[PDB]
Design a protein around this ligand. Structure first.
Ligand SMILES: [Ca+2]
Ligand SMILES: [Ca+2]
Ligand SMILES: [Ca+2]
Ligand SMILES: [Ca+2]
Ligand SMILES: [Mn+2]
Ligand SMILES: [Mn+2]
Ligand SMILES: [Mn+2]
Ligand SMILES: [Mn+2]
Lengths: 232, 232, 232, 232
């Protein structure tokens, strides 16, 4: 079997294993900060620099994966805490959309909310234009920030959030468990055919954005991942 | 919301949080050993002592849960490495079935392979009587050791195995990710309606068994669990 | 080490993690109401359902613990605001004393004020029979409602009170910090040998009581707890 | 009564309520970073800018206090994770000792380990010169980094640690509870006469230090405090 495995307890600027896109910076504590607090429509993304073969054109096999990450969103004086973080999967040539308005697009889509990606968003602002639910939510996105499905959630300022994601290739099920600061678990699962929506090789990463008035601290603290594709 | 959360990095005799059933012992290193290597048809089970309310007859709501555990199965000289471990959910009054033949029943079912439980088995012996697949496998079980679904797997003697399980109440999806010693991941997912198959109050635990000729070391090394039931 | 940890932001009926004794009810807002406003000598107690092993006869080790809770006491028309709330520790077989007169006994002692428990009382009525100080007080209780020690305090009707308790096993010190509505902090500390006064396995909880003419609303709003016992 | 109360969910270098000493920086996420990772013998300290009256020469009364804070220590590549954080109380004119060698002095003492302060250290290096215990430990310091008392502890890289401290003026007891990432609680308590060891007016804060080969990220995430001194 073909397996991709890695673990980041911290991050650093001089690490070729990560592609840094847009306004992302690495803080002295090793945290990735995705958006620039002093920029309008800020967008910042990080990607695991090695493309991952999620499906084989020879066998038709689709990989399963297990991934865990931790993040923190923190309010900043005067700005509206927005827009949130998205854990996403996209073609290996993925870049921040040209002329990105940031905000509700979460740095992965155009103004109409369309793009080429599969993601799990932690959305802290209700965009009517993308049919967002009225509160903070976790969503399963398929080529759109108009989520295929959402679950109510609560983004606690300054709280460290833990996420575990399982993708089971046989049932095509993407399952997400989010561990909040108050101890409660939030789950969301959706059937997503990764072989039908994405190319053979993809890149995994994180994206976050802001607007003129909507800004907040978006931090990626740690990330572990394992994918396994059967080669028989 | 109503949440049950615990974490065991080790275990001890006299820990009121754990109910010991049958041939279970606690080793000096803190590991739980489920079967007795010198006993015929040995059966040992451990349960989290507090009943967990997984669903409520008042609201119709079903809890979601996230649980992780680590185990080890090790061969012993002359005996056939058998029969495996099952992570299970059962009515709060659950006991080893009366007259248990151990073996392929994994300590949760009768001779015909029937019982009252939901589980994830790590099966190391092919029982034709329970329509087991020909190799080692991970199975999803619903009131039977004749699995609703299985996935090929490989039980490596002396290897520490990590498991992560997500139960998403809205989709009724039980998703399982198994991390092997060689780095590869194995996944299996099944829609299981816990509200239809189990009572409101349950016990969670582990069970392992052996036969006359089939015996092996079955160890539970660690266990973390979080369940959250929306109360409204 | 052996650790018991939990966190309640709210409560619910049917939560098997909590034992309800006597006149306890759960309000629609999730608060626990300990006494029945229409009953004479009302006594209601809530216990964390799992016994806690606070010490071991094998090693001689005693657990340390950290616990925080919030409560509210509110006056009702015509009745004298009485009798108060007690955070207590008692043998795992603990029940409301048979023939309890409620009142100044706080639901943990007999008419003479004796019982088998260790507690922290938030006393709102001066019972000369138990040598109560002349004003409202926080007291540390060892097998008696005739406190080993008290500190003057003020119970403000309708005010949410925050309490933090630390038990340090090495010094056997029970330290209490009470955060009043007016912003001031009240503290009280006492050396209490839990290994000498209580059995190995105990239950933690809250109790409140009233008399014929002494009735008030006694609410438990939240409760977090962590205990850790060093094991061989 | 005279009460000092404050709460910091975040910090800013621009704000006048905090005094910054030495190599401290404020990160964009609002965390205080006490040591400079690129400097030999780095020392950084923070203090609540307003002096707090802990005792009175007129009445002889001593204040009680409740304080909670959260921190994080994280390993860096190619350096020994050292030396730790100290929560300290000192005269209002307190400054980093002149010619500070950092390291085992934790930025509060001279080379011999002596200074004018009362503190709670989270020490991650064993200095034989200060009679440190062999492992990581929490200690109660009185004018010396040769702790009056210690308790074994474990500093987990990248983990958020929660601390609660109660000072009870009547018993002169300083009680500390430390909540670890593995779930366990660690406690330490010591009788410390603040009137005898410190002036009437003091400053509260945090200090951390490194050496040539001993460096690590030292972060202060949040801090709440309440002190009350009886003026009658
Ligand atoms: Ca949005
Ligand atoms: Ca079998
Ligand atoms: Ca009384
Ligand atoms: Ca040291
Ligand atoms: Mn959304
Ligand atoms: Mn099987
Ligand atoms: Mn009293
Ligand atoms: Mn030390």
């Amino acid at each position: 079997a073909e397996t991709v495995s890695f673990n980041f307890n911290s991050f650093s600027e001089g690490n070729p294993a990560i592609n840094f896109q847009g306004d992302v910076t690495v803080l002295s504590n090793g945290n990735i900060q995705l958006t620039n607090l002093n920029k309008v429509n800020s967008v910042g993304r990080v990607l695991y620099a090695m493309p991952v073969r999620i499906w084989s054109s020879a066998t038709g096999n689709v990989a399963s994966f297990l991934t865990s990450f931790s993040f923190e969103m923190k309010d900043i004086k005067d700005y509206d805490p927005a827009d949130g973080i998205i854990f996403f999967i996209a073609p290996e040539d993925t870049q921040i959309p040209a002329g990105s308005i940031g905000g509700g697009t979460l740095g992965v889509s155009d103004t109409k909310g369309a793009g080429h990606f599969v993601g799990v968003e932690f959305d802290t602002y209700s965009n009517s234009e993308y049919n967002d639910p009225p509160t903070d939510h976790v969503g399963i996105d398929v080529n759109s920030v108009d989520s295929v499905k959402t679950v109510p959630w609560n983004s606690v300022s300054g709280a460290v959030v833990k996420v575990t994601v399982i993708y089971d290739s046989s049932t095509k099920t993407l399952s997400v468990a989010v561990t909040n600061d108050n101890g409660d678990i939030t789950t969301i699962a959706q059937v997503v055919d990764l072989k039908a929506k994405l190319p053979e090789r993809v890149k995994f990463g994180f994206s976050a954005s802001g607007s003129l008035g909507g800004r907040q601290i978006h931090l990626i603290r740690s990330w572990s991942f394992t994918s396994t594709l059967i080669t028989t």
